[PDB]
Symmetry: D3
Subunit: 186 residues, 6 copies
């Protein structure tokens, strides 16, 4: 198939590359063509050349790459810089962790997790973005290395995180992992 | 923005609705417009009206809704009908469950899980589809109700599954959940 | 220039001819091309092939030719069939006649005009439609034949009417003419 | 609906705004959509990118806003600057005034109207442009203030003018008003 | 590259295949892409959906495949059916043969060639069509088998013909060949 | 008809003029419209605005005008500059001349033709280009002036050449002419 999209000028070459990959993948959820067979053409318009409601329109500035926002937030959390982490978040951000623990304060999380392990470090196997009609949703998964509270090291403990965004800011985090499954029981 | 897509005749009204929603969401990963502002127009062509390589082309039949394939497979598994379940799968299907247990045989899974709970039943909170350039990827999550092996009932145990597909068939399953986190320890 | 327009199926061949003439004339208010040089192409879409807001849309049924509505109302008024005339009108229809007389009741008009002439009959020289962003506006003009109240005949008395419409119904009438200019003064 | 128009480069942002409003209104004479629902996209082409008859074409320079030409001519006439007024006119310009008086010379008009009032000054309620296939046609109307020949002042006397243009110049004027209707009769 | 063409309904699937191959080859005279990379999409319009000069237009019926017309004429000439051959021709058809002999009458040709060989039979190596802006031009070439006037057989004598057409009928024929080069000289 | 073509930026105004004439003529092999009725519009895209296979693509640099390449080679051959002539040619270039003589070496040709005439000079009546799906093919024809080996002059001897190209270089030459037909026989 061939996809054309009409948009106002002002998007970067990198924003366009994202949009083009995104449209190409959307086609592949219905049409089992290889990416190589799918064309995306973008038609950029000056403000004077576009009109809706008999008025000119001003383009909404692009959203940031949601997957990179998510990675940057989780990197900031591993560096323990909470002041910076809170800048990625909506005022009503909610996280849910294993056991169903629901928290709204990043410091509540740190208290809670101290009892569960000394530290943990994420290795990422993959980021997937799920385009929805309420904006993008980010899934990332891979493995954890760390130490149980007695200093015993572990590695390779599967994890997965899900983030919902709102106007580029993180609004909901959900977390699932294999920690309780691999924890030693004496 | 306005999206046009050119495709050969032969897709159903329902396949088109999927493709149109999918393209609309793709736009929203970069352009923070509301769905209401985004138009998708589909231009359908008879075979005589399309030519690539100076030849007519024959359309690849649509892929099934991946999320519905996934739901149907997991429903079949809850009914214990393995013969039917295997028809959803590629010959090299691989599942990975908590602890990192890797299995290729649906009967291996049933043996293994019998030791972990009497039964479990999924309530779905959400299906998300992640369009990628290797085809769609399905994420679903919600909660489990069941009984521990001693007959003790539990409900509301968070879970998440991830499926990768290949030409409409399920090729990779990954599973993460809160069972070991909620299991009673005596 | 070349004009394309994308619309949902359901318009008649005659509604399309109106729309095509209308778009062709719009171009000529800025570009001094002859009609012969201007192309209009209409792209008709089945409901399954169009999507805004990730939903299908249902086309608003065409407006009637405003100039013909206006002619039909004025013909009905010349036949004195007020019951039928009132069906062309909005509930708040207002007419303004020479001297600035403002009336909302068709019977008020008949009372008033009886003192001004025995009868009058319109010959139309032209109908012009003014496309605006509040819908079409109709101008028609030509001459009147009739009799002054003493039975003296006149012909060829210039007149002009202006109508504003609202959802196909007549909402405002304004009238200007040469009657008082040609009336005999003894 | 969605309207695309293909045109050669060289039109101003203001000429485009006129053309876009004009096309938007044309749609509304048939399709009862609100302006807000109607999109106009203009595709501008360099000369090297357009070909008709296997040759490049040179764009006809835009027509001036006909309504503004008309206003400027009538303002010049109120200032009594006939030398400048004649520059707006075709060589065969014809005016028709109440009683059907037909004149081709602006000085003939001034002679004639001196007997009818001392002076008159237009207040404009509205300009409407009627796109036709012989070019734009301008209608304007509102009220007159002035003095009858005995110095008696009047205000609020309804008037309407109609202009036909030809290649940007005024070619036909028609006038209708309430003066004879409001003139005092002693 | 991607080529779209807009045309009125009424062309056959075979006329479209010709037009699509023809447009694909035109691209390849400038852009060194393989045919496989070049897409042609044809947009067919009902009469009600197309307008030029504010009127509907009626499509000119397709031209026949010029190469097949040429082959059919030359086959008819080999069968000696002149009555049928003349139906392929314009009233002013002109042929030019080796030595520059110019003839307008098919019977003149037969007289002339009788002195040159007993008979000759064409084997075609290729037909090429040259799209020009005065319509298509056909070139065909291959070899001749026959007998010199003394009954001596020859084969494999190179030839080439060129035809210019006019509204589907043959208007000019030019011929060049190796006969005089291979004729035996005693 | 109306033709649009979508291409990457980087073609000259002259390459576009060729492509536009070429597409216009292609239409005329099926649709008997005059060139004046046929529109070609070229849509040029920046690399950031085009994507196939979810990657940006780099345009293949234009082919040179094949007819001009052919003329330049034949002009170089008339000047006897073989070193320069060989630069127009593929490594496997093959020429076939009257009698079917097949040669791969430009010096072989010069030896052979010395026995046939003192010299010859081409006057061109026409170049035609035949767009095919293996690239352009060039036909040129007109007349020869020269001298037979005894110094006797001739003029006006019809000739025709055909060239097949490959990636802009000449790959096959075929030649047919009236020399043996006009040679004097004593």
């Amino acid at each position: 198939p061939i996809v054309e999209i009409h948009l106002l000028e002002g998007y970067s070459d990198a924003e366009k590359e994202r949009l083009g990959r995104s449209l190409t993948a959307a086609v592949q959820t219905v049409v089992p063509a290889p990416p190589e067979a799918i064309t995306v053409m973008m038609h950029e318009m000056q403000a004077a050349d576009y009109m809706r409601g008999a008025t000119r329109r001003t383009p909404a500035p692009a959203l940031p790459d949601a997957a990179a926002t998510v990675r940057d937030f989780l990197d900031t959390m591993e560096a323990r810089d909470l002041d910076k982490a809170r800048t990625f978040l909506t005022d009503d951000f909610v996280m849910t962790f294993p056991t169903g623990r629901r928290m709204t304060d990043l410091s509540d999380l740190v208290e809670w997790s101290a009892t569960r392990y000394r530290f943990v470090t994420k290795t990422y196997d993959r980021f997937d973005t799920a385009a929805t009609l309420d904006g993008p949703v980010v899934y990332c998964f891979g493995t954890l290395r760390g130490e149980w509270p007695d200093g015993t090291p572990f590695d390779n403990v599967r994890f997965i995180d899900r983030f919902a965004l709102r106007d580029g800011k993180l609004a909901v985090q959900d977390v699932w992992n294999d920690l309780e499954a691999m924890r030693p029981r004496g």
